[PDB]
UniProtKB/Swiss-Prot annotation, chain B:
One of its GO terms (biological process) is phenylethylamine catabolic process. It catalyses: a primary methyl amine + O2 + H2O = an aldehyde + H2O2 + NH4(+); 2-phenylethylamine + O2 + H2O = 2-phenylacetaldehyde + H2O2 + NH4(+). Keywords: Calcium, Copper, Manganese, Metal-binding, Oxidoreductase, Periplasm, Signal, TPQ. Residues 646-667 are annotated as: Disordered. GO terms for molecular function: calcium ion binding; copper ion binding; primary methylamine oxidase activity; quinone binding. The active site is at 379 (proton acceptor), 462 (schiff-base intermediate with substrate). Topaquinone (TPQ) is generated by copper-dependent autoxidation of a specific tyrosyl residue. Ca(2+) 2 binds at residues 569, 663, 666, 668, 675. The modification 2',4',5'-topaquinone is found at residue 462. This is Primary amine oxidase. The enzyme prefers aromatic over aliphatic amines. It comes from Escherichia coli (strain K12). Inhibited by 2-hydrazinopyridine.
Length: 723, 720
């Protein structure tokens, strides 16, 4: 049997391939492996180490060829140290394909299962956090058997079963009264068909100028709750259906059929209601965003390279990097989970964060017309953002020196799915860690490195990017970015000089002919179980104030700080003024100067869109009443195993706040106890032409800073002078 | 006949040498030059291009040797295209070393010129803006000759002269009544000697438990103005002197001598007042920040390589990059200046910014005690941030892929100084420019590149960084970083369990034993003469608001926008609410949609330290009266040649606001006119242990976004 063409197989396999004709040297890059190899050479170089090749690379008539074994021999070499194998499995490891298939098999074996039964979530049910910490810090095995939460959708009915996988037995099976299921993948499909089979809807569509109809693209949206004012029965399973025309530019979003909404009952599998408003001609101009009508730029290359491999290690799901240690896993709803986060301080791992992850997000609009009044995406709770993860485009969505992880989750039928390139891990240069150039002395400066964990999820039209950023000095950043395609309203005006302009643009900017970028908000929320050098913490406020000078001298005022504790959940739920300081401290543990070891919580560290002061809804709005998390930037709640979502566990047609509103309502004491920090950061998005047909990536930042957690500059390095 | 050592001379040249034994290949990198050469090969490669060698590189005792003509033949070969020759000089070019030496001669030729005169600033007096714009847009030569502003300090007396360099004539000699001069380099020396030769002071120092008064390090400070209440004569040239004790750790800041203040008159050359307060033992423990007591952890290498060279071109000081074109100048006072900034929109250069620069900054303190109450650093205005540029540490202050620039200015004796590595220019990956993964379809992604122009200037204890960030899509960012050594106050308490601890921390945090980091602000102001697609612009607010729904259906409320012009300088001076939109519009030009071409001005786009909602001073403080720009995040003034500084031209011991206060004073109309935008961003700095003995770099962000300036995603590329 013959050999295999080098360049060909390598691309298949996903490695970058560079040929240097002058040096006669290939350079092959893939994740932590940086490989050098010359034609006909004895050995290749992997991360700076020699690897024997029995079969040297071959150059024929300018075509290169390698062994059938080359990719494995080189890349799965072990000279790339990036990945190591976990000895004792971590108790928070996500369910395996096997474990998943098992949980599904356990439920299918109970009396009540039925074949239309879909799966909305199949996730590990973590052991109690204490056993989990003892594992991470003390290597104590966890005694409790691996269980899994299985949330089923039986038609429209939700049921929560719990399975024991160690013992292969079913533990719980309770129906959840009045709860609606999230949107599932087949739902998209049913809605396109039901609409395609609608005799009415084709006629509805025909009159709005269409022709064909095979060309109508639908998109499913949840209906929220309007105490019946929308005319929709509280206990049917429904979705409203917004439609666009497909014009062949690959961007149906650019051609709304405006003032046409259809309500579909998924159980019935038919259209129960059609709201029709004024006919507005469908905007027809081609607006591709993929570059089909564009000139490719020539750009000179830029390569971020790490030729001796990475400074992090990935053992199972454990990531070790400089002084950080943490566990990375995936959840179908909220995406990545970052757990058991410790910072190694001169030998001892100190607790920073037991579990951190997106909590939930919402993007709600502020137009009142039929196509828009109920329109509000709960991307994670309602559509499942983990499930909808978008594989990273190597080199573009993440820098060329990224390592990209694959992650496994159950699909909605309980069959395992591996998502390729689900999370990017990458170290990056982030300016000077610090510098001082004393006048007439040698300069002092060192470089800053952040380790970024990056995840992207696309829900319908928008794409959202999350970066969890680990500074070497102890600071942790969380940024959310938004890009993709705007939800636009069809309108009669071509320019602002047209007669309809003022009325068309009342609720958003006219971003293209006949196209308005309806104003709305982007609201993310992070649930951060920060255990600051321990479980029991308190929330401290420091408000800088200008106080009168009462100490003589020429000054009239001084800069002082009003420090006070925040002792309950109700006061902990607040607006964040970035001029103040909010600290989660450990009142049991002080640094060398006798200050309580803490972390400074900053829900607003800036962003590139204007910032929402709060929810852009009157207090009487139903969406306002069910989603408290929207109106406050900072919350802190007592820890409880079940409380995990800012929007509540079943937010679809919820009638009341079951999220942060619910968790803080019992107003528990936040003094010297296990806290959980929630940060809400929102923007108000008034659109502009620069953002159409594709919105350039826009960012918000949040930050978590060590505050007297340490004794000194954390990046000074190992001490020599004494101990 | 003569070979030099490769590793030795290349490193002397500033290049990076990498040997790779496996390919037998040298990689030589320097600025835009990326060179690859094999030992004994008759050709090399520069930026992906072939170069014939005169003399092949020779290995010997496994050391490499090169022809004495090698560096020039390889790096100055023309295959590195980063730098091109400027055949027609841009009219905003700074004074050259020769023009500097010339301007100094024109003033030294006058009879008015007094013997020991120093030079506070020597800079180009630019031709009028309309002619500058015409050079950069229509290649229209400027009629005007090269002139210069020469501002002189005759002991304590400021004199402003203008000289004509082309005609070697003096044009004006204007003594400036009542103006105090900025602090000059030698003033630092004076102060140390004067303190050294002080009987009275050595005495005071000994009381405070100091043995050798020669280990006493002085630091000079402007004294400000307090209408007499500090006891200081208005006419005398003064400085206050905070003092620290050199203990051998290289960090004298870590060792204050608290409540010892000396007031020195630089014309009399003596102390004129010694304020002494309670006695605090000098904190003594070694606190170096230089690594003498540390061992770095081993780090795998990271390189950011551009093996075919840069996407930008630097032609003299004109920089070209993708659709951006601009001019980079160095000023001794405010540092870099970004000028004639145009965006190439599908082949037509549209004006964005006429001139942008730091306008000024201030670092004022919150403590009322003896040695703090007057402490306020106007770094650019009082010390000369350009002059005090701290050369970029290659690969550390800027990434390994930067190109570092030398910049020339005049020292205080009128002699030219070349500042090596004054400014860093580099391109970087800033994540996906845009992305859409439509479901079941081929993904769409493009990478964001940003071009950064980075300058670092150090003023005593603090080091500051400015990034001017150009985005391919038309956004410009301006970030400001701060690092270095905090101004600390010596106290009795070691921990917070000590008696004095409460009293000790009333005005700042306890960050080391016996060390309190006094609270203060960091306030930066950027002067941005924006010309949004032309000269004549207007300032337009867009406040997003919730309004009751009137269109029917079940919504009680809607998201709407309150829009209105802001018609004068006085209304234009305002607090910035990051939830609102402020635009500089051009009411004469509009995009395809009929919206006027505009720029979104965002003076607060975030920071790593807490933000000030304004000056942390009561309205009757003298610093507050003097420095109005502290308390508003946005200004817009009518453009006039002489209005450059928010803190005012001569802010040393100023009795009233001669900057933005003065400029908006006359409440000029801003409707359809030449506007200048000033952005104030500032932090309230409450210290922490983690920032001692050296503060990890903190950042603040500002942003200027095109707003209906273009007709669509500007990064899509041209149509086929
Ligand atoms: Ca906690
Ligand atoms: Ca609670
Ligand atoms: Ca202007
Ligand atoms: Ca004015
Ligand atoms: Zn948006
Ligand atoms: Zn500071």
């Amino acid at each position: 049997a013959h050999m295999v063409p080098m360049d060909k197989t390598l691309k298949e396999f996903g490695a970058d391939v560079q040929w240097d004709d002058y040096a006669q040297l290939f350079t092959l890059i893939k994740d932590g492996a940086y490989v050098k190899v010359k034609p006909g050479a004895q050995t290749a170089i992997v991360n700076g180490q020699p690897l024997a090749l029995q079969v040297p690379v071959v150059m024929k008539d300018n075509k290169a060829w390698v062994s059938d074994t080359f990719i494995n021999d080189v890349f799965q070499s072990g000279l790339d140290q990036t990945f190591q194998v976990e000895k004792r499995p971590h108790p928070l490891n996500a369910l395996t394909a096997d474990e998943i298939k098992q949980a599904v098999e356990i439920v299918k074996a109970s009396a009540d299962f039925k074949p239309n039964t879909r799966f909305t979530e199949i996730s590990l049910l973590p052991p109690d956090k204490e056993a989990v910490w003892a594992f991470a810090l003390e290597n104590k095995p966890v005694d409790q058997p691996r269980k899994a939460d299985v949330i089923m959708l039986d038609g429209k009915h939700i049921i929560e079963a719990v399975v024991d996988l160690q013992n292969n037995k079913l533990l719980s099976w309770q129906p959840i009264k009045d709860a609606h299921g999230m949107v599932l993948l087949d739902d998209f499909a049913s809605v396109q068909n039901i609409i395609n089979n609608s005799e009415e809807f084709a006629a509805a569509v025909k009159k709005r100028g269409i022709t064909d109809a095979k060309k109508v693209i639908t998109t499913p949206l949840t209906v929220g709750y309007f105490d019946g004012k929308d005319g929709l029965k509280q206990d049917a399973r429904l979705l409203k259906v917004i439609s666009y025309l497909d014009v062949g530019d690959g961007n149906y979003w650019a051609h709304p059929i405006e003032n046409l909404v259809a309500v579909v009952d998924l159980e019935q599998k038919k259209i129960v209601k059609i709201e029709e408003g004024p006919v507005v001609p469908v905007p027809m101009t081609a607006r591709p965003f993929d570059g089909r009508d564009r000139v490719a730029p020539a750009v000179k290359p830029m390569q971020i390279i790490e030729p001796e491999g990475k400074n992090y290690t990935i053992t199972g799901d454990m990531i070790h990097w400089r002084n950080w240690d943490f566990h990375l896993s995936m959840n179908s709803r909220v995406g990545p989970m970052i757990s058991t986060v410790t910072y190694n301080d001169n030998g001892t791992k100190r607790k920073v964060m037991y579990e951190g992850s997106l909590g939930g997000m919402i993007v709600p609009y502020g137009d009142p017309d039929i196509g828009w009044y109920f329109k509000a995406y709960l991307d994670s709770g309602d559509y499942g953002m983990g499930t909808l993860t978008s594989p990273i485009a190597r080199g573009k969505d993440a820098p060329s020196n990224a390592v990209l992880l694959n992650e496994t989750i159950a699909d909605y039928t309980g069959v395992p799915m591996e998502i390729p390139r689900a999370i990017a891990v990458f170290e990056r240069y982030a300016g000077p860690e610090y510098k001082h150039q004393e006048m007439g002395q040698p300069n002092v400066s060192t470089e800053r490195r952040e380790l970024v964990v990056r995840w992207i999820s696309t829900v319908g039209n928008y794409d959202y990017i999350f970066d969890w950023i680990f500074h070497e000095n102890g600071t942790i950043g969380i940024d959310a970015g938004a890009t993709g395609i705007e939800a636009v309203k069809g309108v009669k005006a071509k320019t602002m000089h047209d007669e309809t302009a003022k009325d068309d643009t009342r609720y958003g900017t006219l971003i293209d002919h006949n196209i308005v970028g309806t104003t709305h908000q982007h609201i993310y929320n992070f649930r951060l179980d920060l255990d600051v050098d321990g479980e029991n913490n308190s929330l401290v406020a420091m408000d800088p104030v200008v106080k009168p000078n009462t100490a003589g001298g020429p000054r009239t005022s001084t800069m002082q700080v009003n420090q006070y504790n925040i002792g309950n959940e109700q006061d902990a739920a607040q607006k964040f003024d970035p001029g103040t300081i909010r600290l989660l401290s450990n009142p049991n543990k002080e640094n060398r100067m006798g200050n309580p070891v803490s972390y400074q919580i900053i829900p607003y560290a800036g962003g590139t869109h204007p910032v929402a002061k709060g929810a852009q809804f009157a207090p009487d709005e139903w969406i306002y009443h069910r989603l408290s998390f929207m109106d406050k930037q900072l919350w802190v709640t007592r820890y409880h195993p079940g409380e995990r979502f800012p929007e509540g566990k079943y937010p679809n047609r919820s009638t009341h706040d079951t999220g942060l509103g619910q968790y803080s309502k019992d107003n528990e004491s936040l003094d010297n106890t296990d806290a959980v920090v929630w940060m809400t950061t929102g923007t108000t998005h008034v659109a502009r032409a620069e953002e159409w047909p594709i919105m350039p990536t826009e960012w918000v930042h949040t930050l978590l800073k060590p505050w007297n957690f340490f004794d000194e500059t954390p990046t000074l390095g190992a001490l020599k002078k004494d101990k």
